Amino acid sequence: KIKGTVVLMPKNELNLNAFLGRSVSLQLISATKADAHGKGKVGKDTFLEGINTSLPTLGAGESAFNIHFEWDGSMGIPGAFYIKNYMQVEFFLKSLTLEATIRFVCNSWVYNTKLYKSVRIFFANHTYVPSETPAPLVSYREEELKSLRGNGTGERKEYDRIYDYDVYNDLGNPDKSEKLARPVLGGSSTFPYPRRGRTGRGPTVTDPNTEKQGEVFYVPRDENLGHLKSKDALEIGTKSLSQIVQPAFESAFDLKSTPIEFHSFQDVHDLYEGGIKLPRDVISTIIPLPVIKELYRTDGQHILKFPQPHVVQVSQSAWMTDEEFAREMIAGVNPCVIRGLEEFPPKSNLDPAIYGDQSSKITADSLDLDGYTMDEALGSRRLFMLDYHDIFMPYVRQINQLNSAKTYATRTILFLREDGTLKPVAIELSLPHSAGDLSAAVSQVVLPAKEGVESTIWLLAKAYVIVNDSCYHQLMSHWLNTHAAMEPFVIATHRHLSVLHPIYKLLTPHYRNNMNINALARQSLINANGIIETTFLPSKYSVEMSSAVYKNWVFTDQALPADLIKRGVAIKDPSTPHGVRLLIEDYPYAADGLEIWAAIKTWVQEYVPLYYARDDDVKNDSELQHWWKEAVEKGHGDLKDKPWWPKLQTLEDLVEVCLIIIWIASALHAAVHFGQYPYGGLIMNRPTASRRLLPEKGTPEYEEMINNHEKAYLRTITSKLPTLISLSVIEILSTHASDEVYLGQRDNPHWTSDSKALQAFQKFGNKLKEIEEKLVRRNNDPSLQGNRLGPVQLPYTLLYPSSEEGLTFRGIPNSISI
Ligand SMILES: [Fe+3]
């Protein structure tokens, strides 16, 4: 008899005896002895015998069960097993351990046997490329993959484990209102877009191309992460905020129970100090909700108090400094858009026949480059820019036609001072111009000013820039480049790489909760009249703008070195450790990022060789080839015609592809995600919208700039209501769940039986700890204070590998998990 132990979690953990009797049966499958068809022999249905209470090591609401299998040596060595749950309620199977040791890491929900087309099968923790699969498991290996792919049809149900693709045609809500109709993103040259997980709810009544609404947006069952602690279900918070809290906030404003607008900057600071007083029933709607209740301190009656944002923890006014404005471009929430500027004036590739003369109005002689001439600044590579002119110009006219939205396509010129810090030297606020324009508003250039109305105009100019930046950051740097771009690879991986596959094991930890947060996002974050549309500048144009940007998305340019080189902030240099020399030496995001990038590169470079000896071995891996082909031709199908896609016929290519995927999912996402509330928790520092253009002299609006600059600023940026909603969502997002799995960690120490792979993973983890010590030394280095801390005195810790739970401003999760 083979002694076995089954560890599982009853549904109520997210009694024992109910699992005994004939409730749960398992059948071992042989990996060495096959029947007359080459398929591993199957043992007899074996039921759980009893509750085991021996080894202390057994937490997380887990329970262990004893079981003995009738298995003779003549049946070979078990390498897999079937399991059938005869109970009505599903349970979470953690693992099976056979002694005499064979391990099975399952971590999967097992629903009642009648709901499955085929019996749930689980494999032992061994790792095999297709050609190494023991012959008696080959068919079982391919059948499970076929099962995971489904047939492309049907409405997906909660227990389904079917991975497939579909376009973003589920954001609009045309059946509710024509105003909620949205273009389908993906599948057209007009709107290319990464694919998302297929749900199959069917067409809406008014539009066959739009998927009907659903109360629950399906994701393959095991992608929907349960949490032992409800406070850790952060992804569900977006839904509660949109469906329950937002309406409650709106009622307080409709009933005029709180001023509609912030009237001074102190009104904004009050949010995290004394707080904001709201109607009793409004507080009562919020205080009992899981996750939402953790967002604010309350007296339980009328007060909501937000946590003090990191950016104001030392100086509440430092965000207003030109120093901090520029520093956040290299160490802020969106540190990856700035580019080197090698010619002057900056040029535009936009059609002047459509937008009017696109020549920059910025004159070189007007800039203060600390004594440098323009030619000297250009040649010494000290000139940079945050360029949103070409990106935004195509949408300015339509955004500005909206009732409470007015923006400019902005461009900010930055000069790298001799002390190594960046200083903003001009901002161009551009507007498109065409015959027949009703508006008399014109483009203009604003220069730094510390006194008088000019200083107010310059402060407002910075605000229009950050509105451009916040939109680009949330929709492109964050949503498009991490969340959306990664989902196609998650789907392809489960569809074509067996759980036995080395690359599946290498990549899957980096997909944890990605499909889940994405599905919840399609439902409440990026949907018509969703959180983003109702809080950010572009309104109903928000998501389609990210499709326009995706036209220029390049997989290989996501690699950190390539990105730095492409943006002109670094140059290739073999004589350096990372192969690139930064043009801004103390560029926190880039410098810390290169360290993390290198650690991941080493790990992948050490792992791949363990399973692929030569290039031919990669070319001959059928699953790997089918995986990559599908990821590209279907997942990111609208760009399948591009030349830059790696071919994946070499070890080099496999390493590159895995390295980039891991980078995007871990460090890239953490860097653009966990600083949201730390930096944006003060709406003045990261405005999400602008509501009017600069005022004409001789108007009351112009007089206001002179007499009440704070009010002029507040009337221009995001209004108080959407601010409250936006602060709440980014507070939720910036929080690390206590059950997060960070880079250098895995959810199970037995994910593979291969000791060599396990040793390499341990080295990767040690290297990350080593890197963290180095980053701590950088933050403590006084010579780097200007860019790593700034006048806000906020140490750049976003790329520190580790973190405790909470809103910590540090820690790199393995995946896009929130
Ligand atoms: Fe995110």
Q: How much distance in Å is there from the Cα of 330 to the middle of ligand 1?
A: 19
Q: What is the 3-state secondary structure (H, E, C) of 50-77?
A: EEECCCCCCCCCCEEEEEEECCCHHHCC
The coordinates were experimentally obtained by X-ray
Q: What is the 3-state secondary structure (H, E, C) of 723-787?
A: HHHHHHHHHHHCCECCCCCECCCCCCCCCCCCHHHHHHHHHHHHHHHHHHHHHHHHHHCHHHHHH
Q: Which of 225, 246, 267 is the last residue of a domain?
A: 246
Q: How much distance in Å is there from the Cα of 40 to the middle of ligand 1?
A: 43
Q: How much distance in Å is there from the Cα of 817 to the middle of ligand 1?
A: 7
**Helix (H) or strand (E) segment spanning residue 703:** helix 700-707
CA distances to 120, 194, 526 from 553, rounded to whole Å, are 39, 10, 20
Say yes or no: 514 and 465 in one domain: no
Q: Tokens in use for 1?
A: 């008899």
| 579 phi, psi to nearest 5 deg | 80, 0
Rounded CA-CA distance 711/265 in Å is: 8
Q: Tokens in use for 700?
A: 């009351």
Rounded CA-CA distance 723/262 in Å is: 10
Beta bridge partners of 582: 570
Q: Tokens in use for 134?
A: 């023991």
CA nearest neighbour of 243 among 286, 182, 204, 277:
286
Q: Tokens in use for 6?
A: 């089954």
| 574 phi, psi to nearest 5 deg | -55, -30
Specify whether the CB–CB gap between 81 and 27 falls below 8 A: yes
CA nearest neighbour of 293 among 240, 224, 257, 228:
240
Q: How much distance in Å is there from the Cα of 818 to the middle of ligand 1?
A: 5
Beta bridge partners of 91: 10, 110
Specify whether the CB–CB gap between 266 and 551 falls below 8 A: no
Q: How much distance in Å is there from the Cα of 234 to the middle of ligand 1?
A: 12
Output b/e per residue, 714-733; b: 16+ Cβ within 10 A.
bbbbbbbbbbbbbbbbbbbb
**Helix (H) or strand (E) segment spanning residue 277:** strand 276-277
| 110 phi, psi to nearest 5 deg | -115, 105
Placement of tokens 């009505």 in the chain: 88
Say yes or no: 474 and 539 in one domain: yes
Q: How much distance in Å is there from the Cα of 561 to the middle of ligand 1?
A: 22
CA nearest neighbour of 484 among 526, 532, 435, 453:
526
CA distances to 572, 746, 786, 809 from 586, rounded to whole Å, are 17, 32, 9, 19
Residues 6+ positions from 156 with CB-CB distance below 8 Å: 162, 198, 199, 200, 218
CA nearest neighbour of 816 among 440, 561, 519, 425:
519
Q: How much distance in Å is there from the Cα of 521 to the middle of ligand 1?
A: 10
Specify whether the CB–CB gap between 584 and 592 falls below 8 A: no
Q: Is 665 helix (H, G, I), strand (E, B) or coil?
A: helix
Q: How much distance in Å is there from the Cα of 594 to the middle of ligand 1?
A: 21
Q: How much distance in Å is there from the Cα of 247 to the middle of ligand 1?
A: 24
Say yes or no: 262 and 239 in one domain: no
| 813 phi, psi to nearest 5 deg | -70, 160
Q: How much distance in Å is there from the Cα of 478 to the middle of ligand 1?
A: 6
Q: What is the 3-state secondary structure (H, E, C) of 468-498?
A: HHHHHHHHHHHHHHHHHHHHHHHHHHHHHCC
Rounded CA-CA distance 564/557 in Å is: 9
Rounded to an integer, what is the distance from CA 295 to the centroid of its chain? Answer: 20
Q: Is 810 helix (H, G, I), strand (E, B) or coil?
A: coil
> 309: domain CATH number?
4.10.372.10
Q: How much distance in Å is there from the Cα of 796 to the middle of ligand 1?
A: 19
Q: How does DSSP classify residue 789?
A: T
Chain interruptions in the chain, by residue before each (C–N > 2.5 Å): 14, 100
Rounded CA-CA distance 218/159 in Å is: 9
Domain with 331 in it: 247-335
Q: Tokens in use for 442?
A: 């014109």
Q: How much distance in Å is there from the Cα of 628 to the middle of ligand 1?
A: 24
Rounded CA-CA distance 505/180 in Å is: 41
Q: How much distance in Å is there from the Cα of 159 to the middle of ligand 1?
A: 26
Number of compact structural domains in the chain: 5
Angle, nearest 10°, between helix axes 485-496 and 622-630? 150
Say yes or no: 574 and 559 in one domain: yes
Say yes or no: 526 and 616 in one domain: yes
Q: How much distance in Å is there from the Cα of 484 to the middle of ligand 1?
A: 10
| 479 phi, psi to nearest 5 deg | -60, -60
Say yes or no: 697 and 770 in one domain: yes
Rounded CA-CA distance 284/722 in Å is: 20
Q: How much distance in Å is there from the Cα of 725 to the middle of ligand 1?
A: 17
Q: How much distance in Å is there from the Cα of 669 to the middle of ligand 1?
A: 6
Rounded CA-CA distance 728/736 in Å is: 15
Q: How does DSSP classify residue 168?
A: B
Residues 6+ positions from 136 with CB-CB distance below 8 Å: 30, 31, 32, 33, 34, 38, 39, 40, 41, 76, 79
- Rounded (10°) CA dihedral 367, 373, 378, 383: -30
Q: How much distance in Å is there from the Cα of 531 to the middle of ligand 1?
A: 14
Q: Is 662 helix (H, G, I), strand (E, B) or coil?
A: helix
Specify whether the CB–CB gap between 596 and 659 falls below 8 A: no
Say yes or no: 433 and 555 in one domain: no
Q: Is the dihedral of CA 104, 109, 112, 118 positive or negative?
A: negative
Beta bridge partners of 476: none
Q: How much distance in Å is there from the Cα of 185 to the middle of ligand 1?
A: 20
> 25: domain CATH number?
2.60.60.20
Q: How much distance in Å is there from the Cα of 514 to the middle of ligand 1?
A: 9
Q: How much distance in Å is there from the Cα of 355 to the middle of ligand 1?
A: 34
CA nearest neighbour of 294 among 781, 778, 694, 734:
734
Q: How much distance in Å is there from the Cα of 784 to the middle of ligand 1?
A: 28
Rounded CA-CA distance 142/135 in Å is: 12
Q: Is 212 exposed, middle or buried (0-12, 13-18, 19+ CB in 10 A)?
A: middle
Q: Is the dihedral of CA 628, 633, 639, 642 positive or negative?
A: positive
Specify whether the CB–CB gap between 560 and 591 falls below 8 A: no
Q: Which of 246, 264, 289 is the last residue of a domain?
A: 246
* Residue 812 C-beta-side C-alpha neighbours within 13 Å: 30
Specify whether the CB–CB gap between 691 and 404 falls below 8 A: yes
Q: How much distance in Å is there from the Cα of 359 to the middle of ligand 1?
A: 37
Q: Is 416 helix (H, G, I), strand (E, B) or coil?
A: strand
Q: How much distance in Å is there from the Cα of 799 to the middle of ligand 1?
A: 15
Rounded CA-CA distance 70/500 in Å is: 25
Q: How much distance in Å is there from the Cα of 667 to the middle of ligand 1?
A: 11
- Rounded (10°) CA dihedral 254, 260, 266, 271: 20
| Amino acid found at 252 | A
CA nearest neighbour of 692 among 722, 712, 708:
712
Angle, nearest 10°, between helix axes 485-496 and 514-524? 130
Q: How much distance in Å is there from the Cα of 526 to the middle of ligand 1?
A: 13
Q: How much distance in Å is there from the Cα of 664 to the middle of ligand 1?
A: 11
DSSP line for 613-628: SSHHHHHT-HHHHHHH
Q: How much distance in Å is there from the Cα of 479 to the middle of ligand 1?
A: 7
Say yes or no: 637 and 538 in one domain: yes
Say yes or no: 319 and 358 in one domain: no
Specify whether the CB–CB gap between 796 and 596 falls below 8 A: no
CA distances to 402, 439, 689 from 442, rounded to whole Å, are 18, 8, 20
Say yes or no: 229 and 256 in one domain: no
Q: How much distance in Å is there from the Cα of 670 to the middle of ligand 1?
A: 8
Vertex 554: Cα angle to 549 and 556 (nearest 5): 155
Q: How does DSSP classify residue 308?
A: P
Q: Which of 316, 335, 354 is the last residue of a domain?
A: 335
Q: How much distance in Å is there from the Cα of 745 to the middle of ligand 1?
A: 19
Vertex 441: Cα angle to 439 and 442 (nearest 5): 130
Q: How much distance in Å is there from the Cα of 204 to the middle of ligand 1?
A: 29
Rounded CA-CA distance 155/166 in Å is: 13
Output b/e per residue, 242-269; b: 16+ Cβ within 10 A.
beebbebbeebbeeeebeeebeebeebb
Q: How much distance in Å is there from the Cα of 116 to the middle of ligand 1?
A: 33
Residues 6+ positions from 652 with CB-CB distance below 8 Å: 615
Residues 6+ positions from 721 with CB-CB distance below 8 Å: 249, 250, 253, 260
CA nearest neighbour of 85 among 115, 63, 42:
115
Rounded CA-CA distance 265/456 in Å is: 14
Q: How much distance in Å is there from the Cα of 265 to the middle of ligand 1?
A: 29
Rounded to an integer, what is the distance from CA 798 to the centroid of its chain? Answer: 14
Specify whether the CB–CB gap between 238 and 520 falls below 8 A: yes
Vertex 323: Cα angle to 396 and 585 (nearest 5): 100
Rounded CA-CA distance 359/342 in Å is: 16
* Residue 180 C-beta-side C-alpha neighbours within 13 Å: 21
Q: How much distance in Å is there from the Cα of 473 to the middle of ligand 1?
A: 11
The residue count for the chain = 818
Q: How much distance in Å is there from the Cα of 477 to the middle of ligand 1?
A: 10
Q: How much distance in Å is there from the Cα of 370 to the middle of ligand 1?
A: 39
Q: Tokens in use for 89?
A: 């309620």
> 365: domain CATH number?
3.10.450.60
CA distances to 122, 386, 539, 652, 743 from 511, rounded to whole Å, are 20, 31, 30, 23, 12
| 347 phi, psi to nearest 5 deg | -105, 165
| Amino acid found at 84 | K
Specify whether the CB–CB gap between 437 and 396 falls below 8 A: no
Q: How much distance in Å is there from the Cα of 448 to the middle of ligand 1?
A: 34
Q: How much distance in Å is there from the Cα of 451 to the middle of ligand 1?
A: 39
Q: How much distance in Å is there from the Cα of 166 to the middle of ligand 1?
A: 21
Q: How much distance in Å is there from the Cα of 481 to the middle of ligand 1?
A: 10
Region for residue 752 given its phi and psi (left: phi exceeds 0; alpha: psi -120 to 50; beta: otherwise): beta
Q: Is 814 helix (H, G, I), strand (E, B) or coil?
A: coil
Say yes or no: 708 and 619 in one domain: yes
Q: How much distance in Å is there from the Cα of 168 to the middle of ligand 1?
A: 18
Q: Is 129 helix (H, G, I), strand (E, B) or coil?
A: coil
Q: How much distance in Å is there from the Cα of 816 to the middle of ligand 1?
A: 6
Q: How much distance in Å is there from the Cα of 336 to the middle of ligand 1?
A: 15
Q: How much distance in Å is there from the Cα of 305 to the middle of ligand 1?
A: 24
Say yes or no: 425 and 486 in one domain: no
Rounded CA-CA distance 519/203 in Å is: 18
Rounded CA-CA distance 562/567 in Å is: 9
Neighbours of 697 (CB within 10 A): 9
Q: How much distance in Å is there from the Cα of 683 to the middle of ligand 1?
A: 19
Rounded CA-CA distance 274/288 in Å is: 21
Rounded CA-CA distance 733/483 in Å is: 13
> 714: domain CATH number?
1.20.245.10
Residues 6+ positions from 705 with CB-CB distance below 8 Å: 453, 456, 457, 460, 695, 712
Q: How much distance in Å is there from the Cα of 815 to the middle of ligand 1?
A: 9
> 206: domain CATH number?
4.10.375.10
Q: Tokens in use for 226?
A: 């349960």
Q: How much distance in Å is there from the Cα of 275 to the middle of ligand 1?
A: 27
Q: How much distance in Å is there from the Cα of 636 to the middle of ligand 1?
A: 20
**Helix (H) or strand (E) segment spanning residue 80:** strand 78-85
Q: How much distance in Å is there from the Cα of 786 to the middle of ligand 1?
A: 28
